[PDB]
Amino acid sequence: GPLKPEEHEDILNKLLDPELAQSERTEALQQLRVNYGSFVSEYNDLTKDYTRVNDDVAAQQATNAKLKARNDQLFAEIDDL
Amino acid sequence: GPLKPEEHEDILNKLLDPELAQSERTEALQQLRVNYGSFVSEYNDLTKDYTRVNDDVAAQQATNAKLKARNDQLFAEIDDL
Incomplete structure (x- = not known):
């Protein structure tokens, strides 16, 4: 299912650096x-x-x-009969 | 409440641009x-x-x-009586 909060933070860390390769920037954005x-879907499943x-x-x-x-x-x- | 999918996408759009001002980059990663x-908390509330x-x-x-x-x-x- 969805990324754990530490997995998500990891991606946000990669994206902090401007020196990051473009194939890797777009790849990290796609993961997000x-x-x-x-x-959203998992929240729908529970809903x-x-x-x-x-x-x-x-x-x-x-x-x-x-x-x-x-x-x-x-x-x-019961009172009647 | 969490960002709508289109608001989240918009932040990802900003972050695609490697030329983006570092001041706006950190503001965007913060929002994410x-x-x-x-x-996670909304999902916890529902759980x-x-x-x-x-x-x-x-x-x-x-x-x-x-x-x-x-x-x-x-x-x-009612059978006894």
């Missing part, structure tokens, strides 16, 4: 470019699963509300 | 460094709440089974 995209799980919670809260209702209904239908 | 930390919610899922399943069991024992003593 591609890495940024990777990071997607977070969305799924918050929907499970909500749907289960409603399902448990329905069962709590039927349990109070059957608790009242 | 700081932004990288901000992004934290995701963890919390996955524990809410488990606790919702447990409450469900705790209601479905009491729903069984009440339905069963």
Whole structure:
């Protein structure tokens, strides 16, 4: 996945020096470019699963509300019979 | 919040030019460094709440089974009477 913070800092270090070869400047920039995209995507992956799980919670809260209702209904239908 | 992809790209565009003023180069590398930390932190914020919610899922399943069991024992003593 995405670069570790020390790997990213390393690239930023190479880029500090103007004396750096052009094939290596563009190569380091491309690593940053591609890495940024990777990071956005990984954040999307987690967002997607977070969305799924918050929907499970909500749907289960409603399902448990329905069962709590039927349990109070059957608790009242016990004094009668 | 972390830089948008187009703002990040823009910084990479500036840094491609070897003639760029050293004052602006270090300012640009700074923005990248700081932004990288901000992004790790945003991802951490989301990981934290995701963890919390996955524990809410488990606790919702447990409450469900705790209601479905009491729903069984009440339905069963509707046969006794």
